[PDB]
Every structure is written in structure tokens, then in C-alpha cells.
Write a protein that binds this ligand. Structure first.
Ligand code: HEM
Ligand SMILES: CS[C@H](Cc1c[nH]c2ccccc12)C(=O)O
Length: 407
């Protein structure tokens, strides 16, 4: 027996590949917690075991506040990214409760459930734009614009400014410690200027939306200007990137498992179950967001010094054989199917009801209206996107639409 000091390469995070699951399993079988080179040169750990991910997700010794980063990382993150500085996503107790309170009611299940008719119209309006018996990229035609439209209408942001939101979201979702600095600063400043002007307009006649609730909190001193702007940015990013990748990953997985797609066609009621299995197997967030040791700490026997990054692999947690029978089998009937793909504890996804509802309406409507859509390319041509973001998602999903039935 000899002690081993190997550090998981950066690429395990930034450039995983088509099947990174075997690699994660090999690391996980040896230990739940490992040194990882993310960002490059940093003291950082990856957590791969389901149960230890679950503990870490809720462990208050891990801070989400950017001021708890070592100075060289803190200074770089703050100068670049409006995302990391002032929202509930990057807040510990008690700031987390203050930053969460103005928006939490808007995301309750029974409230979100009233968006069903408008979501259905958005989905139908998008499918109406498909070329019948043509070819689409499902991401650009549907998976991106559907949830962007939903969160835009729900905030009371003009749908017309779609491509600005798509670009700002993609750039500002990237890790400011790994991604081009100039790009993120420009995105931060362009987002700031747009929303400064929109808020000033919306203030002069508050409308009864979420943006009006957010403006009210700002005007009452519950949010600073930065916290209003950072909060809007999280809601926009987390609002559409995750749902986009759920529809993209999910459609690819169903086409890769055609008998289970036929099952969903025959019995549409199974679609919520299929959504949960999509989230376990290829969850839109492969990693939980920024966490740093606030103090010297031990997690599952490994000593993590103060200031170390701790990266939680939701992807690895989804395939843990301690939790799931046949973890690498995709089975839409898996039940119950408890997973960590929406996180756990105080930062549990506020969007989960809204994401689950959009998933059900999206897949129900695609399967009903396009009775036989298929891949437009050989499956080996379907590429997973590599970037510094928390995402697990496709570059593109070429689809032959086939016949298109009316809404
Ligand atoms: C399938 C869809 C989605 C997935 C897979 C997903 C995943 C997550 C995950 C893993 C976290 C926890 C991050 C952590 O602990 O570091 C989370 C938090 C959050 N997500 Fe979602 N998300 C979903 C859709 C949404 C939607 C539609 C919204 C709309 C605004 C949303 C807004 C939130 C926000 C605001 C947080 C931070 C909550 C907090 O820190 O207290 N998400 N999401
Ligand atoms: C949907 S995955 C991710 C965006 C995201 C989801 N939840 C978060 C909490 C904090 C910070 C960022 C995120 C992406 O980049 O695709």
C-alpha cells in the first residue's frame, strides 16, 4: 500500500467528452473526495459520492460568498462576473434569506401551476415555426427560446430582446476564473445598462410581475442596486439554460432509447417520470455552483484547508450504485427516483416546480404534435458542449421534424 497524490485534471470539469461517466465511476470507487485542478493552480476538491454530495450541498462550513475566496480568485471573479456577487445563489445565512424572500412566493408550485396555459401557447407558437417535413436544430429552434420566453414574460422583460439575453446568459454562466475576462466584463456592463434603463421605465408604473416585486425590494432597501441586477441575471440564466439542456439532453436520450420513446408516446402520463430520469442521468447542472471552505474542515476523511474550492459533481451523484440499481441504465419508469440534480438543503432550486412544469408541457407537446421526429445526423455526430460553466448540454441537436399536427 502506497499513498497517492493524484489531482483530477482540469479537463474532467472543462472537457469531459461524450461518456465521462466511466471516469467519474473509477474516481468515485476509490474515494468520494479528490484533489481537482479547477480552476488551474488552485487548491480545490471534487466530491463524487451521492451521500457526500448531499452532505456538502447543505454544509455551512462551505461558503457561497465570493469574499471567502483567496484574494487573487476573489478579485478576479468580482472584476469580471455580475453573477457571483449579489444574489441568493452566492449567499450564506443570513444574507441568503434576505435575498430569497422577495422572489420565493413567485416560484411556489400552485402559483407556477397557473402559468400552464401561457407555457402551452409559447410551446405551440414555437412548434408552429418548425418547417414541416424539414430539419431544425432543436436547441436554437425550441429548447433555448421556449424557457427564455417563459422567464422573460414572467419577469415582464420584452421577449423581442431574446438574442441579447441568449448571448449575455451564455457568457455570464462561464467561470470568471477560467473564461476570457474581457468578454465577461463587457457582458456584465451591457446587462447592467439594459436593466438599469428597463427598471427605471418599469418603476414609473409598477405592473404586477416579479420584476415589480424585485424593484419594490430595491426601493425598500431589501436589495442594493447590485443585488437587483445580480438577482435578475441568475433568474435569467438559471431560468433558461437548465430547461434548454433538459429538453436537449432529454430528446437525445429518448432518441437513443427509442422503445422508451414509444412507451412515452403510448402513455403520456409517464412523461413526468421520464423527466426525473433525464435529470438523474444527464442533469442540466453537472456541477453545483461556487463553494469554498470558510475554515479548515474535514469532509468524509479528507482535510480541506480554508480557502479551497469544493466542486460537487451532481453528474457523479446521479450514477452512484449505493443509491441506484443499474445506475448507467436509462429507465423512464425508475420509481421512486430521488436525485441531487436540483441540489439539496438551503440552496435547493427555487425553479424546480417551474422547470418540471416546462419539461412536462415541452415533451407532451413535442410527442403529440410531431408523431415521428428523428435525428437528422448519425448519433456519433451529436456533440456534447465543453465550457467552463456548470452545464451538461449539447452543441446542437439536428432533428427531422416529420409530420406536424396542429396545436
Ligand atoms: C431542469 C431545470 C433546472 C435544473 C437542473 C436546475 C438546477 C439547479 C441546481 C443544481 C441548483 C443548486 C445550485 C447549488 O446548490 O450550487 C439550482 C439553484 C437555483 N435555481 Fe435551478 N435548476 C432548474 C430550473 C430553474 C428555473 C426554471 C429557475 C428559474 C428562475 C431556476 C432558478 C434557481 C435559482 C434562483 C437557484 C438558487 C437557489 C438558492 O441558491 O437558494 N432554476 N438550480
Ligand atoms: C442550469 S446550469 C448553469 C446555471 C445555473 C444553474 N443553477 C445555478 C446556481 C448558481 C449559479 C449558476 C447556476 C449553467 O451554466 O448552465
Amino acid at each position: 500500500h502506497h499513498h497517492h497524490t493524484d489531482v483530477i485534471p482540469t479537463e474532467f470539469f472543462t472537457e469531459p467528452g461524450s461518456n465521462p461517466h466511466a471516469t467519474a465511476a473509477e474516481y468515485r470507487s476509490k474515494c468520494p473526495v479528490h484533489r481537482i485542478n479547477v480552476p488551474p493552480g488552485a487548491d480545490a476538491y471534487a466530491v463524487l459520492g451521492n451521500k457526500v454530495v448531499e452532505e456538502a450541498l447543505g454544509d455551512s462550513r462551505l461558503s457561497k460568498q465570493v469574499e471567502n475566496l483567496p484574494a487573487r480568485y476573489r478579485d478576479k471573479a468580482v472584476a469580471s462576473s455580475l453573477l457571483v456577487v449579489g444574489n441568493l445563489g452566492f449567499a450564506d445565512a443570513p444574507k441568503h434569506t434576505r435575498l430569497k424572500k422577495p422572489i420565493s412566493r413567485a416560484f411556489l408550485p400552485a402559483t407556477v401551476a397557473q402559468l400552464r396555459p401561457r407555457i402551452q401557447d409559447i410551446v405551440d407558437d414555437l412548434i408552429d415555426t418548425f418547417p414541416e417535413n424539414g430539419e431544425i436544430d432543436l436547441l436554437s429552434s425550441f429548447a433555448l427560446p421556449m424557457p427564455l420566453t417563459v422567464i422573460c414574460e414572467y419577469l415582464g422583460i420584452p421577449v423581442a430582446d431574446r438574442p441579447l439575453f441568449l448571448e449575455w446568459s451564455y457568457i455570464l454562466s462561464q467561470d470568471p476564473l477560467q473564461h476570457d475576462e474581457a468578454e465577461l466584463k463587457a457582458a456584465s456592463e451591457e446587462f447592467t445598462d439594459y436593466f438599469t434603463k428597463l427598471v427605471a421605465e418599469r418603476r414609473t408604473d409598477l405592473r404586477d410581475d416579479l420584476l415589480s416585486e424585485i424593484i419594490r425590494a430595491r426601493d425598500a432597501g431589501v436589495y442594493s442596486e447590485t443585488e437587483l441586477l445580480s438577482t435578475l441575471l441568475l433568474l435569467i440564466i438559471a431560468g433558461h439554460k437548465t430547461v434548454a439542456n433538459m429538453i436537449g439532453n432529454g430528446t437525445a436520450l429518448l432518441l437513443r432509447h427509442p422503445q422508451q420513446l414509444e412507451m412515452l408516446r403510448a402513455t403520456p402520463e409517464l412523461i413526468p417520470s421520464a423527466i426525473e430520469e433525464i435529470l438523474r442521468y444527464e442533469g442540466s447542472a453537472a456541477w453545483a455552483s461556487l463553494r469554498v471552505a470558510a475554515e479548515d474542515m474535514q469532509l468524509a476523511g479528507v482535510d480541506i484547508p480554508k480557502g479551497s474550492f469544493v466542486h460537487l459533481s451532481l453528474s457523479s451523484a446521479g450514477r452512484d450504485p449505493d443509491v441506484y440499481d443499474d445506475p448507467d441504465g436509462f429507465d423512464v419508469t425508475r420509481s421512486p427516483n430521488r436525485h441531487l440534480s436540483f441540489g439539496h438543503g438551503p440552496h435547493f432550486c427555487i425553479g424546480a416546480p417551474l422547470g418540471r412544469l416546462q419539461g412536462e408541457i415541452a415533451f407532451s407537446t413535442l410527442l403529440r404534435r410531431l408523431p415521428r421526429f428523428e435525428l437528422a445526423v448519425p448519433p456519433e455526430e451529436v456533440a456534447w458542449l465543453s465550457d467552463s460553466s456548470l452545464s451538461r448540454g449539447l452543441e446542437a441537436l439536428p432533428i427531422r421534424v416529420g409530420e406536424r399536427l396542429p396545436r
